[PDB]
């Protein structure tokens, strides 16, 4: 009888509007009370100061509510959740003037909240015009946040016409976060666009701003793949043949593999085996018999061809 | 429109071949057929079998590749998608040179993948076949690319059989990304390295591949089977 002499205790505790244009504003007026009360007990406490706003639009709307929110606003700039609230309750009465420039202000007051950000513009969409949403979302690059913030703000660009601001932007996003990533994302955009000339160009200045120590093995096949998009048998041996020579131990095999991939579809089986022996001699072999299974190995390949 | 469409050119050539048993045709059949090229996907389709029927009387008139000449007249003039299945049913008897005809497939469906290799197989390009394998697992990915790759390999291995260790190791290697291990298994035994093998099957990572291995081991000799069970205990029915 242990368990059931705190469960019989739950039990037994378990079991044990509004008239008039006058007599309401007495109930309004002592919840008032009540409010300001709780925040002479705690200056800051954002859940009685967040409250206190709400409670006064869905009474009154404007001052009271609008005041409220800015006077907490002074206890702390920086809380993000009273922000948003403040914003929410002016566009659920519709004012949209009237907190454009409230999110102005936020924005201004802390560039590194992306919170702010991205519901700077979703707002804009709604509101209408995107020539607005172009110069928030340009200042917003001056702070040259992340690719997250690029990508929005291409897929602005897309969504809607004009391809060729786009391309722009995609040409600043390199110049400042200038990583292998970025460059292969550029040639995406000339893919739908159907430029094959101007894809080129784009992969060749790649080459130019990166450098030996800068590039990777995989932006090599990023190039091969179009290749295969065009199928031009030209373009393909002669870049495998010159990407393959900067790598070496480093990243070869995967590259190999590839090289190989596109002579399977175009005698001609030289580098077959060639892809093959130094792969079989790549194999590292630590010991005295697994290098000499290894010399059985290659000298086999060497011995077919 | 589709069988409204599709009768109305199998009737309608059939007024001309009536016509034809009348020596009244095969003019007016062309005109018929005009009509069906005039008539305005699937539908469109089966105004892919009334082409494929004008040909097919065409084929049976006594002309068989100016009627060839007349659908590829008109699957070049696609040059869309779902054209492509007449294409399959125009490359289908497009064959009775079609390589290139057969690779506008590959431009824009693994059983038709096979089909076509073992046409070359059947004049024996041999190599050239084996590349088309290689064509195909490029796309489809580790799922049906699995259904192409154990009759490549089954195929491959009865090839060059022993002629190249290298190469088919490798093709192994690419493979690899549960049988392939055992056809894998079973040319190193008699052509590669044996412990090589043995190795191999230990990479595997089930009851019959234990089985398997430890019976390989065996026929290594008998001293590493012991062996091979206290890498086996790590079910009961184990």
């Not at chain 1, 309750?89 to 991205?118: G, S």
């Not at chain 2, 192994?172 to 093998?197: M, N, P, T, V």
């Amino acid at each position: 009888x242990x368990x059931x002499x705190x469960x019989x205790x739950x039990x037994x505790x378990x079991x044990x509007n509004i008239t008039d244009l006058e007599e309401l504003q007495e109930f309004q007026g002592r919840k008032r009370k009540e409010f300001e009360d709780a925040i002479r007990r705690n200056r800051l406490a954002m859940g009685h100061w967040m409250r206190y706003g709400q409670w006064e639009l869905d009474q009154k709307e404007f001052a009271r509510a609008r005041s409220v929110f800015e006077r907490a606003l002074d206890v702390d700039s920086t809380y993000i959740p009273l922000w948003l609230k403040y914003i929410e309750c002016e566009m659920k009465n519709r004012n949209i003037n009237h907190a454009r420039n409230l999110f102005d202000r936020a924005v201004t007051q802390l560039p590194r909240v992306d919170k702010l950000w991205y519901k700077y513009v979703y707002m804009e969409e709604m509101l209408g015009n995107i020539t607005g949403c172009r110069q928030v979302f340009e200042r917003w690059l001056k702070w040259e946040p992340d690719e997250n913030c690029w990508m929005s703000y291409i897929r602005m660009e897309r969504r809607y016409h004009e391809n060729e601001r786009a391309r722009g932007i995609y040409e600043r996003f390199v110049v400042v976060h200038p990583e292998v990533t970025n460059w292969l994302r550029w040639a995406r955009f000339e893919e739908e666009c159907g430029n094959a000339a101007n894809v080129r160009q784009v992969y060749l200045a790649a080459i130019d701003a990166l450098g030996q120590e800068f590039l990777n093995e995989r932006f090599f096949i990023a190039f091969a793949k179009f290749e295969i998009r065009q199928k031009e048998y030209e373009r393909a041996r002669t870049i495998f043949k010159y990407a393959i020579d900067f790598m070496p131990r480093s990243k070869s095999m995967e590259l190999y593999k590839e090289y190989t991939h596109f002579e399977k579809q175009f005698x001609x089986x030289x580098x077959x085996x060639x892809x093959x022996x130094x792969x079989x001699x790549x194999x590292x072999x630590x010991x005295x018999x697994x290098x000499x299974x290894x010399x059985x190995x290659x000298x086999x390949x060497x011995x077919x061809x | 429109x589709x069988x409204x469409x599709x009768x109305x050119x199998x009737x309608x050539x059939x007024x001309x071949x009536x016509x034809x048993x009348x020596x009244x045709x095969x003019x007016x059949x062309x005109x018929x057929x005009x009509x069906x090229x005039x008539x305005x996907x699937x539908x469109x389709x089966x105004x892919x079998x009334x082409x494929x029927x004008x040909x097919x009387x065409x084929x049976x008139x006594x002309x068989x590749x100016x009627x060839x000449x007349x659908x590829x007249x008109x699957x070049x003039x696609x040059x869309x998608x779902x054209x492509x299945x007449x294409x399959x049913x125009x490359x289908x008897x497009x064959x009775x040179t079609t390589r290139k005809l057969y690779d506008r497939v590959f431009e824009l469906t693994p059983q038709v993948v096979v089909n076509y290799a073992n046409l070359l197989e059947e004049n024996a390009y041999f190599e050239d076949s084996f590349k088309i394998y290689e064509r195909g697992v490029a796309l489809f990915s580790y799922p049906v690319a699995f259904e192409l790759w154990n009759l490549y390999l089954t195929k491959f291995v009865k090839r060059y059989q022993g002629t190249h260790m290298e190469r088919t190791r490798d093709l192994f290697e690419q493979a690899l990304e549960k049988s392939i291990y055992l056809l894998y298994a079973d040319f190193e035994e008699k052509f590669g390295k044996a412990k090589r093998s043995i190795s191999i099957l230990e990479k595997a990572a089930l009851a019959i591949y234990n089985v398997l291995l430890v019976k390989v081991a065996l026929n290594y000799g008998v001293l590493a089977t012991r062996t091979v069970y206290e890498k086996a205990i790590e079910x009961x029915x184990x």
